[PDB]
Design a protein around this ligand. Structure first.
Ligand code: MG
Ligand code: MG
Ligand code: MG
Ligand code: MG
Ligand code: MG
Ligand code: MG
Ligand code: MG
Ligand code: MG
Ligand code: MG
Ligand code: MG
Ligand code: MG
Ligand code: MG
Ligand code: MG
Ligand code: MG
Ligand code: MG
Ligand code: MG
Ligand code: MG
Ligand code: MG
Ligand code: MG
Ligand code: MG
Ligand code: ZN
Lengths: 50, 69, 102, 91
RNA sequence: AGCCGACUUAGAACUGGUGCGGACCAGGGGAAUCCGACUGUUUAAUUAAAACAAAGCAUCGCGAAGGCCCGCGGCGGGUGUU
RNA sequence: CGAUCGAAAGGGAGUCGGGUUCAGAUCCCCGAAUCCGGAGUGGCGGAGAUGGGCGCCGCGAGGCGUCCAGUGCGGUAACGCGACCGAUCCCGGAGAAGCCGGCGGGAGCCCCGGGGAGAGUUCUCUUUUCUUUGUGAAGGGCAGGGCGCCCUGGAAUGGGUUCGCCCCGAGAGAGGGGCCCGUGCCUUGGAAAGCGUCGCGGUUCCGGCGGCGUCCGGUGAGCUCUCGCUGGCCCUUGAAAAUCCGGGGGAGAGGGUGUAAAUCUCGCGCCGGGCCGUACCCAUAUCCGCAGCAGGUCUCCAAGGUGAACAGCCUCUGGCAUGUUGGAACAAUGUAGGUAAGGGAAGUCGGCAAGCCGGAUCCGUAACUUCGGGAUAAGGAUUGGCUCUAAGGGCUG
């Protein structure tokens, strides 16, 4: 809703910031196993709880 | 907004300390004198083209005049 | 209170695509007064024709846009509807200009 | 003209609830909605407001009365008995 | 006497290849039997009923340290602001 | 009278107009306001309040000195005027009230007759058809609406009066006033802005500059909203508190006749208003049903015609692309629609399904009954178009 509270909006802010892909330079590292971001979330598919 | 019926009270409202500006609107069958004070925009309505011109010289010199168009 | 209106079609006359005379006899046969079109409704509507300027006067209530309607009827009669355009420069007057493409 | 022959107030109930029940409730529904005379101002503007409450339109006087009538015969006799006992006690 | 305006109702004449609530909108009816008075409600996803409820009628308990009931327990609680 | 919590639909002071973005606006910009809180010196003005007597003087106009008064004033009244001291205490009001019916007023929308401006048709006709044609909050004035407000006067041959009601010697009619709401009109705002139309600029990056116009009327059992009056219903009587105000009391305070005092809900002047939410969807694709699922999910606005109608059908503003695809064929059997000679339920467990009837006007209407009904009982007749006639009203003298 548009009638958010501060803690809910801050939680949504963090979950917005975690929803970006991995930077390109991390898999040029030596001890690297990550191919992509597997913890990604789409707004239509996964409904974040709440 | 406030309307001043007489000419004599208009001079006191223009000579107030809080009079920011005075502006003259020249339309048909009417001359309008508007003093922007702190709270109200005081308007003097003159339907005499001779008295409008003499009052225009009779404004106080410390007040800022903006002849509108 | 006399009502006087002017219709100045200077531009189509100087271009030669239309002549003001054939417009003026079309007016003098085609203005209706009190439901009667022929014979000018008596001597109440007078029409003078200057050089590409037709002046009309009337002491009965005469609508100005009736002249616009009759002029657009004349342009449709002589296929000038897609070329000329009847506008009002000042009031009690009408102008024949062109469409402003290119 | 005369609209109904034997039903009065209870003609609003139509063809329901039983003839004897309608005949019972007819007396209550007449006396409940009738306007009584006022004992204080004399005007006939003593109208029921709720059960036990009768309000006068002119005098603005409201009286605790009966449920369907302004006065009950079970209380008029009590009023008489209390005034005779009041005279008896003081002699 | 003059000047103004709003929708209706009734009647008459004429008229169409008897068609005219021209589309749309829009009750089939009657004589009876059984049950439930009726209005209402009900098995969400097989049963809407004659089942339930209902007003009316009739019994039963109780005058408050009481009747009925709740609660592991309290000078506990509901009916009871009775 | 119980800490405290408990409503983004209850209560709850106070913001509106124009413009602006690729995406935000009662929040940004401009212009107009407004509410609350604050103040020693209280910033100013006004009110409190500057009056009378005596004795002199001055011709008088008036001037000094004493003795006092002065916490305002007007109206018969309803009450009014810009203020107009007062505490602990007490009383009262507002917040603060259901559902339904009828009527009246005011807006908005629709409707009709004209003037403009711009468009559409013009094969023939059409002074024709379409679009548009205005003013915020706050203040002041005036209409209009309401009054269970006041004064005179005393009424039956009873009157006044509504749609209905209802009112009156506890004072009707008839005259004269008073109050409340005034969302309507005018004015300040405010034409400077907005809109329509025409034309010039900036070669453009422009709240660019100009010329005109934004007008006059009439109507309505119209629809919606709102205000008000009156009535009906209840064995149903339809919230509380925060907060605010008025009154009754008169403990007190202030000054001795003035650079008057205490005090002020009057007019201005000064400062401030912190924290959180604000984008978008809101539903045959942004929510819940495993999904862009024919399901479900609370509200506001509500044009023209036909018509009783927020019914159905067509259209305007606005919107969309036929609902997770297209092309070509037109076989059966399907699904969804129809139509059928003659017969008319012979079909079937069973008139299942389908069909008949249907609106309105005119008559007409049984058995039975709890007298209310049954009842649109049943039964028939009429219905188009066009041209007329008659009847049903206000305004002015
Ligand atoms: Mg979902
Ligand atoms: Mg039998
Ligand atoms: Mg039943
Ligand atoms: Mg079931
Ligand atoms: Mg079923
Ligand atoms: Mg709270
Ligand atoms: Mg709230
Ligand atoms: Mg009277
Ligand atoms: Mg302008
Ligand atoms: Mg007092
Ligand atoms: Mg928004
Ligand atoms: Mg879809
Ligand atoms: Mg399709
Ligand atoms: Mg398609
Ligand atoms: Mg057949
Ligand atoms: Mg047949
Ligand atoms: Mg058979
Ligand atoms: Mg058989
Ligand atoms: Mg059937
Ligand atoms: Mg029957
Ligand atoms: Zn009384």
């Amino acid at each position: 809703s548009s009638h958010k509270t501060f803690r809910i909006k801050r939680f949504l802010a963090k979950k917005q910031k975690q929803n970006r892909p991995i930077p390109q330079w991390i898999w040029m590292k030596t001890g690297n196993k990550i191919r992509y971001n597997s913890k990604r979330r789409h707004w239509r598919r996964t409904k974040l709880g709440l | 907004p406030r309307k001043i019926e007489e000419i004599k009270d208009f001079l006191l409202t223009a000579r107030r300390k809080d009079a920011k500006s005075v502006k003259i609107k020249k339309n048909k069958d009417n001359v309008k004198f508007k003093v922007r004070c702190s709270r109200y925009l005081y308007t003097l309505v003159i339907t005499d083209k001779e008295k409008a011109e003499k009052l225009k010289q009779s404004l106080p010199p410390g007040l800022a005049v903006k002849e509108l168009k | 209170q006399l009502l006087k209106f002017t219709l100045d079609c200077t531009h189509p006359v100087e271009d030669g695509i239309m002549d003001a005379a054939n417009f003026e006899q079309f007016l003098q046969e085609r203005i209706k007064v009190n439901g009667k079109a022929g014979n000018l409704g008596g001597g109440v509507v007078s029409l003078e024709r200057s050089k590409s300027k037709i002046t009309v006067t009337s002491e009965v209530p005469f609508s100005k846009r009736y002249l616009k309607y009759l002029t657009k009827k004349y342009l449709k009669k002589n296929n000038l509807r897609d070329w000329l355009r009847v506008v009002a420069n000042t009031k009690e007057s009408y102008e024949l200009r062109y469409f402003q493409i290119n | 003209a005369k609209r109904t022959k034997k039903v009065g107030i209870v003609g609003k109930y139509g063809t329901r609830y039983g003839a004897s029940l309608r005949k019972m409730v007819k007396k209550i529904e007449i006396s409940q909605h009738a306007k009584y005379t006022c004992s204080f101002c004399g005007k006939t503007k003593m109208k029921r407001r709720a059960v036990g409450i009768w309000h006068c339109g002119s005098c603005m006087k409201t009286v605790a009365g009966g449920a369907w009538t302004y006065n009950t015969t079970s209380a008029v006799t009590v009023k008489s008995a209390i005034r005779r006992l009041k005279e008896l006690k003081d002699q």
